[PDB]
Amino acid sequence: THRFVQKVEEMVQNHMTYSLQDVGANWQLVVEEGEMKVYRREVEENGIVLDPLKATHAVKGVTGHEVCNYFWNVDVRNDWETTIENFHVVETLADNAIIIYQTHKRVWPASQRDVLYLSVIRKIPALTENDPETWIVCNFSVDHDSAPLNNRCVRAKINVAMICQTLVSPPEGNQEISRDNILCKITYVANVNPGGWAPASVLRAVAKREYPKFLKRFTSYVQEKTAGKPILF
Numbered sequence: 001t002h003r004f005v006q007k008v009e010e011m012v013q014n015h016m017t018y019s020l021q022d023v024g025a026n027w028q029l030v031v032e033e034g035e036m037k038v039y040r041r042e043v044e045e046n047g048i049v050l051d052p053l054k055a056t057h058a059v060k061g062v063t064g065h066e067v068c069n070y071f072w073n074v075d076v077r078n079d080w081e082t083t084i085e086n087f088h089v090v091e092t093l094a095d096n097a098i099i100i101y102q103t104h105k106r107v108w109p110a111s112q113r114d115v116l117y118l119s120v121i122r123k124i125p126a127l128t129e130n131d132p133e134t135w136i137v138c139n140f141s142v143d144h145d146s147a148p149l150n151n152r153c154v155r156a157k158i159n160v161a162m163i164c165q166t167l168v169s170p171p172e173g174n175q176e177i178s179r180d181n182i183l184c185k186i187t188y189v190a191n192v193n194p195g196g197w198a199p200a201s202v203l204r205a206v207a208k209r210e211y212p213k214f215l216k217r218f219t220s221y222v223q224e225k226t227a228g229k230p231i232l233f
């Protein structure tokens, strides 16, 4: 156990309840690239862009467990992440939960941002014998007494989740499932609070360009790293 067990439960359950809904007009579809659909709502609070982002995608030949492991595992973070300048693991809470501090590349003309968040990976059992199991990574801001002092940075706050359900062809008697017959259905949600002044059109343009690039690059990277390796369901 650790002091955030209840908090992690609430944040994960909130995603399972609300984030997995189909978007079916309050979500604007902003970018479509094949099976990748990126939606957003335009929201500003006390002057600053909060725009909730939600994306679906469908990735052949990887499992949700694999996607979530690659997304969570700090040891491969630098192989796919292109927005971070530095990260530091502040605290380990469990084999599946850590607290990370990171600084991002500056988005001109706004100040550089930093972020301090708990990152957790969980498997959520099928709601009924008829539903898929879900693997989820949730990255959500927390406070911490060993927060770094970084005067060049404004502190952003995030609530992100990478949510995956995996569909397979069943095994034909004594024969494994091939990666050809697996499909990972992703819902990715990102609620980022810049934590201070930033110009709305720039944030919007950057989100619209960079989220699709991120999803494409990260999902390709998982396919590339898992090709020809045993499936980890």
Ligand SMILES: CC(C)(C)c1cc(CCc2ccccn2)cc(-c2ccc(S(=O)(=O)CCO)cc2)c1
Binding pocket: 081, 082, 083, 104, 105, 106, 107, 110, 111, 112, 113, 139, 156, 158, 160, 190, 192, 193, 194, 198, 203, 206, 207, 210, 214
């Ligand atoms: C422009 C905007 C899209 C809002 C934005 C700006 C910045 C840079 C820091 C920042 C935030 C706000 C304003 C200025 N700079 C970071 C993020 C962000 C952070 C973390 C995650 S994650 O999925 O946990 C890793 C994804 O690669 C995703 C996106 C988004």
